[PDB]
């Protein structure tokens, strides 16, 4: 029950949970481009010149 002292420890192993692999996909997923505005189909002159 004396509990004598011991020598100096050489190395200290650190145990830790691993990096989060297979979380990010190898291609990227962007928000798609909002489309450029279209001229709508079915546009015709509705105004006739009077008389």
């Amino acid at each position: 029950g004396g509990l004598t002292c011991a020598s100096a420890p050489q190395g200290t192993l650190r145990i830790l949970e691993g990096p989060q692999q297979s979380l990010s996909g190898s291609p990227l997923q962007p928000i798609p481009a909002s489309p450029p505005p279209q001229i709508p189909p079915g546009l015709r002159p509705r105004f006739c010149a009077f008389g």
Binding site: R44, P45, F47, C48, A49, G51
Partner: protein, 49 residues
């Protein structure tokens, strides 16, 4: 160029009818023309009206 000219005016003005194989264009009811000057945007045909 006659079908191009028929769309630069209001619908009714330039009729495009065939005269011996070619599609010539003539005026027909110039009253309908809204006078929007869209033919003066066209470079080849701002010299034929």
């Amino acid at each position: 160029a006659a079908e191009e000219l028929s769309r630069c005016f209001s619908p009714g003005v330039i009729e495009v009818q065939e005269v011996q194989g070619k599609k010539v264009a003539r005026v027909a009811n110039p009253r309908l023309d809204t006078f929007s000057r869209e033919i003066f945007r066209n470079e080849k045909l701002k010299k034929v009206v």
